[PDB]
């Protein structure tokens, strides 16, 4: 029951929660999430490019038919922030941690328009995060990046580590280039602490695992040490 627009697939997970799926020209999926919620619709990370992060928002007005409200961004790479000019041209407004947006010309992404902060419980500082309706934002530490950021979605079992958690039988922690290989397990553990319930993980590059991949993660992660 996937659905193709153009270069992206989406997967229901919920019955107002999609996994999008784009791919880096051999072919490199990235997920990312769409999020029903009454009568908007908020996304989870863009697509690798601007063209795909636009298809994303046309399969949206095509398939739900709401209005794209908000979008959150979960840190300064390619696979989550390449698209930020396409949302902008969409007129959504736009949300990453605040260091992720002072690292964006870094790591040649355009910044969000807002900056999000954080507590030192990795919890969002909630007037930074103005109407996300069920989207907890939380940091769990420093991970896959410095700035890595996850979401769970409220009123479902789901949710969302980005590129910092990988799936239960992987091999690898992936792409290590820009990592805190000291703090990683912990980070990968403090997600998992924060939405003890979920039991549907969402990640970057694997299909949606069980929590056995934030465990596993962190395995691997240890024996970065
Ligand atoms: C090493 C493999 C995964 C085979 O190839 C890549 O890394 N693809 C990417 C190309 C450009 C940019 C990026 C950024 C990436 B993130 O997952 O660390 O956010 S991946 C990636
Ligand atoms: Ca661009
Ligand atoms: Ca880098
Ligand atoms: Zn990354
Ligand atoms: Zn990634």
Same mark, same amino acid.
């Given at each position: ?6 270069? +992206? ?8 929660? *999609?996994? @999008? =799926? ?10 990312? &999430? ?7 619709? &908020?996304?989870?990370?863009?697509? *690798? ?9 046309? *399969? ?5 038919? &709401? ?9 300064? @790479? ?5 698209? %930020?000019?396409? +949302? ?12 992720? $947006?002072? +690292? ?12 999000? =902060?954080?507590?030192?419980?990795? *919890? ?6 103005? $109407?996300?309706?069920? +989207? ?13 950021? =996850? ?12 590129? &910092?958690?990988?799936?239960?039988? #992987? ?11 000291? @703090? ?8 998992? #602490? ?5 039991? %549907?993980?969402? %990640?970057? @590059? ?20």
């Amino acid at each position: 029951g996937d659905q193709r627009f153009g270069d +992206l697939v989406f997967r229901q997970l919920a019955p107002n929660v *999609w996994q @999008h =799926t784009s791919y880096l020209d051999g072919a490199v999926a990235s997920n990312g &999430l769409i999020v029903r919620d009454g009568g908007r619709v &908020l996304v989870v990370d863009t697509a *690798w490019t601007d063209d795909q992060t636009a298809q994303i928002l046309n *399969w949206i007005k095509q398939e739900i038919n &709401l209005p794209v409200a908000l979008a959150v961004v979960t840190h300064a @790479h390619q696979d989550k922030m390449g698209g %930020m000019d396409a +949302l902008h041209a969409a007129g959504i407004a736009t949300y990453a941690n605040a260091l992720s $947006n002072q +690292l964006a010309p870094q790591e040649g992404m355009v910044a969000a328009q807002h900056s999000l =902060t954080f507590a030192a419980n990795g *919890w969002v500082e909630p007037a930074t995060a103005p $109407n996300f309706g069920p +989207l907890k934002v939380f940091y769990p530490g420093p991970g896959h990046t410095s700035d890595n950021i =996850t979401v769970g979605i409220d009123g479902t079992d789901i949710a969302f580590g980005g590129c &910092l958690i990988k799936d239960s039988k #992987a091999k690898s922690l992936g792409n290590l280039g820009d990592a805190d290989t000291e @703090h990683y397990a912990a980070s990968a553990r403090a997600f998992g #602490a924060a939405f003890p319930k979920a039991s %549907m993980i969402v %990640m970057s @590059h694997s299909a949606p695992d069980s929590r056995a991949a934030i465990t596993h993660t962190a395995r691997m992660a240890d024996k970065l040490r």
